[PDB]
Design an enzyme around this catalytic site. Structure first.
Site, PDB file in Angstrom:
ATOM      1  N   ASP A 194       0.839  -1.168   0.000  1.00 13.98           N
ATOM      2  CA  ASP A 194       0.000   0.000   0.000  1.00 13.98           C
ATOM      3  C   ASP A 194       0.904   1.258   0.000  1.00 13.98           C
ATOM      4  O   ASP A 194       1.256   1.754  -1.080  1.00 13.98           O
ATOM      5  CB  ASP A 194      -0.988  -0.136   1.180  1.00 13.98           C
ATOM      6  N   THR A 244       6.744  -0.456   4.353  1.00 10.12           N
ATOM      7  CA  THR A 244       7.184  -1.764   4.819  1.00 10.12           C
ATOM      8  C   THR A 244       8.168  -2.437   3.843  1.00 10.12           C
ATOM      9  O   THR A 244       9.252  -2.897   4.222  1.00 10.12           O
ATOM     10  CB  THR A 244       5.925  -2.666   4.964  1.00 10.12           C
TER      11      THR A 244
HETATM   12  N1  LIG Z   1      -5.305  -7.318   5.323  1.00 14.03           N
HETATM   13  C1  LIG Z   1      -4.908  -6.273   4.602  1.00 14.03           C
HETATM   14  N2  LIG Z   1      -3.655  -5.778   4.831  1.00 14.03           N
HETATM   15  C2  LIG Z   1      -3.228  -4.673   4.116  1.00 14.03           C
HETATM   16  C3  LIG Z   1      -4.019  -4.064   3.175  1.00 14.03           C
HETATM   17  N3  LIG Z   1      -3.342  -2.999   2.622  1.00 14.03           N
HETATM   18  C4  LIG Z   1      -2.097  -3.006   3.272  1.00 14.03           C
HETATM   19  N4  LIG Z   1      -1.953  -4.209   3.991  1.00 14.03           N
HETATM   20  C5  LIG Z   1      -0.875  -4.656   4.922  1.00 14.03           C
HETATM   21  O1  LIG Z   1      -0.590  -3.588   5.808  1.00 14.03           O
HETATM   22  C6  LIG Z   1       0.812  -3.378   6.028  1.00 14.03           C
HETATM   23  C7  LIG Z   1       1.296  -1.943   5.657  1.00 14.03           C
HETATM   24  O2  LIG Z   1       1.548  -1.792   4.253  1.00 14.03           O
HETATM   25  P1  LIG Z   1       2.385  -0.566   3.645  1.00 14.03           P
HETATM   26  O3  LIG Z   1       1.735   0.741   3.930  1.00 14.03           O
HETATM   27  O4  LIG Z   1       3.748  -0.507   4.229  1.00 14.03           O
HETATM   28  O5  LIG Z   1       2.591  -0.798   2.189  1.00 14.03           O
HETATM   29  C8  LIG Z   1       1.509  -4.512   5.283  1.00 14.03           C
HETATM   30  O6  LIG Z   1       1.758  -5.630   6.139  1.00 14.03           O
HETATM   31  C9  LIG Z   1       0.477  -4.866   4.223  1.00 14.03           C
HETATM   32  O7  LIG Z   1       0.697  -6.163   3.745  1.00 14.03           O
HETATM   33  C10 LIG Z   1      -5.296  -4.581   2.924  1.00 14.03           C
HETATM   34  O8  LIG Z   1      -6.046  -4.066   2.037  1.00 14.03           O
HETATM   35  N5  LIG Z   1      -5.736  -5.697   3.636  1.00 14.03           N
END
Ligand SMILES: Nc1nc2c(ncn2[C@@H]2O[C@H](COP(=O)(O)O)[C@@H](O)[C@H]2O)c(=O)[nH]1
Ligand SMILES: Nc1nc2c(ncn2[C@@H]2O[C@H](COP(=O)(O)O)[C@@H](O)[C@H]2O)c(=O)[nH]1
Lengths: 170, 170
Positions: A97, A101
């Site tokens: 997202d 991470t």
């Molecule tokens: N279950 C779920 N997790 C999410 C979703 N979008 C982001 N993630 C999880 O949330 C965390 C943050 O993601 P980031 O912002 O760093 O890309 C990561 O572990 C990612 O896999 C979603 O739509 N559903």
């Protein structure tokens, strides 16, 4: 599936896109001469990537790409067991997202001096970006929405569902 | 599927035996009225059980059994998981139980945390290897002590990606 506002991607559709992406990986790695001693290391980002990893591993087997599997956990806590210095490694993610991470994990794997580093992500949400990262294999690109199913959870639940769903508004 | 291996059980047959086990599990836990908030916890013992866990989780979903997933790698990640299982229904998920030294070690470690219940599901039971006495609640397949690879199981970390369970000869 009672908590789902709607099915976003069926199991069958995830499998068809992942099979095609596995054929791409194989083609992209053909000149690397991978064997059992010099395989593609799949780095599974726990918890959510475990189902995608299990299925992608088997599609890669269909394409004759030799693999080894490592499990990592940041949200470090579990690092690779095998040295991946001079190895071909691939970070395996369920969903990206903001990419904060992934960016951390990438930087962190890079300083282990692997032969190459690539990323594969089942669900990419590029409209969510807060930093700039290379996603080499984004299997499916989707709009912002919170998804569950196929390893991804809401409050630890729903990882077991076969389809990827958009979570009902509550 | 390396030159020294022979098929033991095909992917299709593992899937049929696991679907049937998931049905038995659902009936066994019916009177516990599991919900999302009080689910069946699958404790995936890494690395070898990761594919069996991804598949069994989805057969449990087919049966309406709500699950949550945790990963064991056998200080800190073991401790964490142990510290949250008090009065939860937990199921250890293992690829293969042979002498049962490993499974016993993991059972005692979790029991010290006082879960509501603890059961074990095992893809390949090798009861002739036993060095200690443990209850294996759900032995999906029973075999002599051959060396097996595939379906998440390795030799020297290779071959976890194969779809079928093969044996390596002497
Ligand atoms: N279950 C779920 N997790 C999410 C979703 N979008 C982001 N993630 C999880 O949330 C965390 C943050 O993601 P980031 O912002 O760093 O890309 C990561 O572990 C990612 O896999 C979603 O739509 N559903
Ligand atoms: N890959 C593989 N691992 C085995 C095999 N037999 C036992 N194991 C390893 O040994 C562990 C169980 O050992 P135990 O403590 O029960 O003797 C299994 O979880 C697995 O990691 C086998 O045939 N193939």
């Amino acid at each position: 599936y009672p908590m789902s506002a709607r099915t976003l991607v069926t199991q069958e559709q995830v499998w068809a896109a992942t099979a095609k992406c596995a054929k791409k990986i194989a083609a992209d790695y053909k000149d690397f001469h991978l064997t059992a001693d010099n395989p593609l290391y799949l780095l599974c980002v726990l918890k959510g990537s475990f189902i995608f990893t299990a299925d992608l591993a088997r599609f890669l087997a269909d394409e004759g790409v030799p693999v080894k599997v490592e499990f990592i956990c940041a949200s470090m806590l579990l690092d690779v067991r095998d040295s991946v210095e001079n190895r071909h490694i691939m970070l395996v993610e369920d969903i990206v997202d903001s990419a904060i991470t992934l960016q951390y994990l990438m930087r962190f794997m890079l300083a282990k001096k692997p032969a190459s580093l690539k990323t594969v992500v089942l669900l990419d949400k590029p409209s969510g970006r807060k930093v700039d990262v290379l996603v080499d294999y984004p299997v499916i690109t989707i709009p912002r929405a919170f998804v569950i199913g196929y390893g991804m959870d809401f409050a630890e639940s729903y990882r077991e569902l076969r389809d990827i769903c958009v979570l009902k508004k509550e």
